[PDB]
């Protein structure tokens, strides 16, 4: 038949657990604290951030939200991170992506102390993951996807998996986590000649491209597992994914809704990571 | 169809060593004497021979080599302390541990203990991270790097291509795939758990094979005009060394193929040398 990969329900269960954890840390002096850094007033980024803070309060995590100017300098951005780096009351530090062009994204993410790198974008944490290690912080989206799939006991060893989209935020670590899980992985992107060739033979497809209706009924096999990471806003103001959900869901054994699939899972992983960092202080 | 072309890693590496030779003559005169440290734990015959050849390629091109030959049973701590000394020695530009290490020693711990600016094998987690992020400034693992140079030397366009990497190790497969993906190729990564290899190979413009399995890639798995890179090294009973590709049949359908021996091998070595001189050169 067909079964919804419902990250909404799943994330709620996680927040409950983190509620409990923080109470305990909070008693033992450790008040779990995420510092979020927002650059410029892009209302979409502002969206992700509001939600991020709202999630934190929901489950006893102290949010620190630095909404600073779009034009602030690299050194100012850097000096804030330095301070946060050495601020024992701060357990995670996250830069909201993307950043202004005049700023070197990599230097910035690399300058966050790797033990507070809750987004998992610091080179050494990327390295750990690509090595098959769980010795660090894993990026929240790909992590949320795995936790979700693992909740539905979807076995991954040996599957034919296709990741559509090759970004550092999603695609690449997604691929690495699948491959660490024993899956065969194909990574496709804007330059892939014929995407359908990979998608038709795929047991599992992760879509993370930023293109409305990129994945269609005639590109997927009956009983495919489809995870839709994409988030797009139409004229309607209506938020949809990269997958044509109507036509593709009829053919899927399991499939993420949008919204309510990967989104809430992303947020939940950001929370788990922040608390894992807090836990270490003990 | 056009004449098949041998991806001649032996000739290219000889050209590179010659370049490295001149670079070193220049660096000597600036008081920089490129120097590489190699650590060999135990008396593995294959490891031993790999080390000799590393030292010999070093001497060839004007790189001073230091070989540390340690007991099969030495402590994780003793090895860690040695690396520590080498990390701090300003006359050493490259540090390499010969793999594999004995079972009783944590490999990841060892490789991460090497200072990342002397990590000429590119196995330090931070160097693995730079690569995965798309930065090819730092240190890149030698084998997949040598594949890329070799392909580049033959002017092989990779943007948009269908590439299959067979094997998913940290030494070869995973960095190989990242570099092809960095170059704008679509990549598929297969390994021992893949259900069906021909699913991926039949469609491939480029196949990198790196599995340690004799005849893993046969002629009926590939399409006409395919480019086949053979990283494997296997010894048959007859003492002959072959790769993982069925070269005789597969080369008949290939537009470009690496022989074994003499393809990837000398390139892996040339890249360790290049990375070592890269570190030395950085001292200016
Ligand atoms: N908040 C969340 O839960 C969450 C977080 C991560 C990203 N997202 C969303 O998912 C999408 C992915 O984010 P990103 O940072 O990876 O974006 P990105 O633009 O940086 O990367 C896009 C990737 O998809 C590929 N691509 C684009 N169009 C394609 C096409 N028509 N065919 C094949 N490949 C194509 C690109 O080559 C690229 O590799 C975005 O729309 C983003 O809004 C959601
Ligand atoms: N020329 C050189 O100096 C040099 C350097 C690096 C490695 N190598 C050679 O490359 C080969 C692999 O090296 P490694 O370090 O990556 O070894 P490895 O054992 O760590 O990795 C093997 C990979 O290939 C896969 N594999 C094994 N058998 C397979 C099969 N039948 N079908 C599909 N996949 C299979 C494994 O699952 C694994 O992912 C070996 O022959 C090694 O000697 C050459």
3-state SS class at A196: helix
**Does the bond joining B261 to the residue before it have cis omega, within 30 degrees of 0?**
yes
- Alpha-carbon distance of B145 to B82, in angstroms, equals 28
CB proximity B186 to A under 8 Å: yes
Q: Token pair for residue A12?
A: 């709620």
Beta-carbon count within 10 A of A192 CB: 23
Tell me the shortest Cα–Cα distance from A71 to chain B, in angstroms. Answer: 25
CA–centroid distance, A165 to ligand 1, in Å, is: 6
Catalytic residue from among A52, A116, A147, A159: A52
Give strand ranges (E) for chain A: 3-4, 33-39, 62-68, 92-95, 160-164, 184-188, 204-207, 224-228, 232-233, 239-240, 252-255
- Alpha-carbon distance of A218 to B246, in angstroms, equals 37
- A168 and B133 in contact (C-beta within 8 Å)? yes
Beta-carbon count within 10 A of B214 CB: 14
- Tokens 């593995």: give the residue: B44
Interacting residues of A70 by C-beta distance below 8 A, sequence separation 6+: A39, A40, A41, A100
CA proximity to B36, closest of B3, B12, B60, B9:
B60
Which residue has its alpha carbon closest to ligand 1 atom 1? A263
Determination technique used: X-ray
Eight-state DSSP code of residue A218: G
Paired residues of A175 in beta bridges:
none
Binding residues of B for NADP(+): 167-169, 192, 233
CB proximity A205 to B under 8 Å: no
3-state SS class at A86: helix
3-state SS class at A132: coil
**Does the bond joining A242 to the residue before it have cis omega, within 30 degrees of 0?**
no
From A106, A175, A188, residue closest to B135, measured CB to CB = A106
CA proximity to B51, closest of B63, B38, B66, B60:
B38
Per DSSP, the residues of B36-89 read: EEEEEES--HHHHHHHHHHHHHHHHHT-EEEEEEE-TT--HHHHHHHHHHHHH-
In order of their start, the domains of chain B are 1-7+141-265 (3.40.50.720), 30-115 (3.40.50.10860)
Give strand ranges (E) for A82-203: 92-95, 160-164, 184-188
Q: Which-ligand-closest: CA of A173?
A: 1
Mutation for A interface: B193, B200, B211, most A CBs within 10 A: B193
Please work out, in degrees rounded to the nearest 5, the angle formed at the alpha carbon of residue A233 by the alpha carbons of A232 and A239.
80
- Alpha-carbon distance of A32 to A5, in angstroms, equals 29
From B108, B132, B193, residue closest to A157, measured CB to CB = B193
- A227 and A5 in contact (C-beta within 8 Å)? yes
CB proximity A202 to B under 8 Å: no
- B27 and B281 in contact (C-beta within 8 Å)? yes
A164 is annotated as contributing to ligand binding: no
Burial B63-89 (b: 16+ CB within 10 A, else e): bbbbebeeeeeeeeeebeebbeebbee
Interacting residues of B224 by C-beta distance below 8 A, sequence separation 6+: B1, B253
Tell me the shortest Cα–Cα distance from A203 to chain B, in angstroms. Answer: 11
Per DSSP, the residues of chain B read: -PPPEE--HHHHHHHHHHHHHHHHHHHHHTT---EEEEEEES--HHHHHHHHHHHHHHHHHT-EEEEEEE-TT--HHHHHHHHHHHHH-TT--EEEEPSPPPTTS-HHHHHHHS-GGG-TT--SHHHHHHHHTT--SS---HHHHHHHHHHHHTT---TT-EEEEE---TTTHHHHHHHHHHTT-EEEEE-TT-S-HHHHHTT-SEEEE-SS-TT-B-GGGS-TTEEEEE---EE-TTS-EE-SB-HHHHTTTEEEE--SSSSHHHHHHHHHHHHHHHHHHTT-
Q: Token pair for residue A203?
A: 């047991």
3-state SS class at A72: coil
- B226 and B245 in contact (C-beta within 8 Å)? no
Interacting residues of A20 by C-beta distance below 8 A, sequence separation 6+: none
Between strands A3-4 and A252-255, the pairing is parallel
Beta-carbon count within 10 A of B215 CB: 15
Q: Which-ligand-closest: CA of A260?
A: 1
Strand order from edge to edge, sheet including A62-68: A62-68, A33-39, A92-95
- Alpha-carbon distance of B225 to A251, in angstroms, equals 36
- Alpha-carbon distance of A214 to A198, in angstroms, equals 13
**Region of residue B170 (phi > 0: left; psi between -120 and 50: alpha; otherwise: beta):** alpha
- Are the beta carbons of A166 and B181 separated by less than 8 Å? yes
Beta-carbon count within 10 A of B120 CB: 28
- Alpha-carbon distance of A229 to A264, in angstroms, equals 11
CA–centroid distance, A189 to ligand 1, in Å, is: 9
- Alpha-carbon distance of B122 to B140, in angstroms, equals 5
The alpha carbon dihedral of A81, A82, A83, A87 has a sign of positive
Task: Supply φ then ψ for residue A120, to 5 degrees.
Answer: 70, 30
């Amino acid at each position: 038949a067909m079964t919804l990969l419902d990250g909404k329900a799943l994330s709620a269960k996680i927040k409950e657990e983190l509620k409990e954890k923080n109470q305990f840390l909070k008693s033992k002096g450790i008040e779990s604290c995420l510092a979020v850094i927002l650059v410029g007033d892009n209302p979409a980024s502002q969206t992700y951030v509001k939600s991020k803070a709202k999630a934190c309060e929901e489950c006893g995590i102290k949010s620190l939200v630095y909404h600073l100017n779009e034009n602030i300098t690299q050194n100012e951005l850097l000096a804030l991170i330095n301070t946060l780096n050495h601020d024992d009351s701060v357990h995670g530090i996250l830069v909201q992506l993307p950043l202004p062009d005049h700023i070197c994204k990599d230097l910035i993410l690399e300058s966050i102390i790797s033990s507070k790198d809750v987004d998992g974008f610091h080179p050494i944490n990327v390295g750990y993951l690509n090595l098959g290690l769980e010795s660090g912080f894993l990026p929240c989206t790909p992590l949320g996807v795995m936790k979700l799939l693992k909740a539905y006991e979807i076995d991954l060893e040996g599957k034919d998996a296709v990741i559509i989209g090759a970004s550092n935020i999603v695609g690449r670590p997604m691929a690495t986590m699948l491959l660490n899980a024993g899956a065969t992985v194909s990574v496709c992107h804007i330059k892939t000649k014929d995407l359908s060739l990979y998608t038709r033979q795929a047991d599992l497809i992760i879509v993370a491209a930023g293109c409305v209706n990129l994945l269609r009924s005639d590109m997927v096999k009956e009983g495919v597992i489809v995870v839709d990471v994409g988030i797009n806003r139409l004229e309607s103001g209506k938020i949809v994914g990269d997958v044509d959900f109507e036509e593709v869901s009829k053919k899927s054994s399991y499939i993420t809704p949008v919204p309510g699939g990967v989104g809430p899972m992303t947020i939940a992983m950001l929370l788990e990571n922040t608390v894992k960092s807090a836990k270490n202080r003990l």
